[PDB]
Amino acid sequence: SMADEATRRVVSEIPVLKTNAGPRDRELWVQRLKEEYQSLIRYVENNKNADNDWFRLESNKEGTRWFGKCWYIHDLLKYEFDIEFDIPITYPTTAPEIAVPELDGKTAMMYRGGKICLTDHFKPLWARNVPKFGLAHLMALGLGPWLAVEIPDLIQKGVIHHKEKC
């Protein structure tokens, strides 16, 4: 399949996750979070080595609320957007919903409340990989491809404009 090769090309060097545990699962959730933090940190390090350091994320103490920033470069200008998501009770079988609040109401490819609207292809891809995919994969396979279509389109339509900051 083209899809399977496309998936491997993106995620092959991202540490695979193992533990089937959600926010309520106590010592199993603590284990899942270690796998989540190890997968994220390697993804970030690979991203830096490829001049594509495109996001920062932190979580609350319990790892149920995640927030940070993503950066997107167009015609050599860097656009920064605040991002956030909750971990569903049913995670990791259920995929998180990434929100980019500042873009709420600015694109059709987004639900109310700033939750980004993915293609019908991400959700079944997540489902057939459960529980191996985690937050690094959500960024690599969800938000990354979203920004790569929506940010260029909103700049073109003059809805997004660049911060003239030094």
Q: Is 14 in contact with 50 (CB distance < 8 Å)? A: no
Judge residue 3's burial from the number of C-beta atoms within 10 Å of its C-beta, 0-12 exposed, 13-18 middle, 19 or more buried. Answer: exposed
Give the separation between CA 141 and CA 129, rounded to whole angstroms: 12
- Which of 117, 127, 148, 159 does the annotation list as catalytic? 117
Say if domain 2-156 classifies as CATH 3.30.420.40.
Answer: no
Q: After which residues is the chain broken (C to N over 2.5 A)?
A: none
SS3 51: coil
User: CA-to-CA distance for 10 and 125, rounded, in angstroms?
Assistant: 13
DSSP 143: I
Structure tokens given for 91 = 């995670």
Q: Is 70 a catalytic residue?
A: no
Distance CA 77, CA 9 (A): 27
Q: What is the largest CA-CA distance in the chain?
A: 48
Structure letter (DSSP) for residue 71: E
Taking the CA atoms of the chain, what radius of gyration do you get in angstroms?
Answer: 16
| Solved with | X-ray
**SS3 for 82-125, per residue?**
EEEEECCCCCCCCCCCCECHHHCCCCCCECCCCEECCCCCHHHH
List the domain boundaries for the chain: 2-156
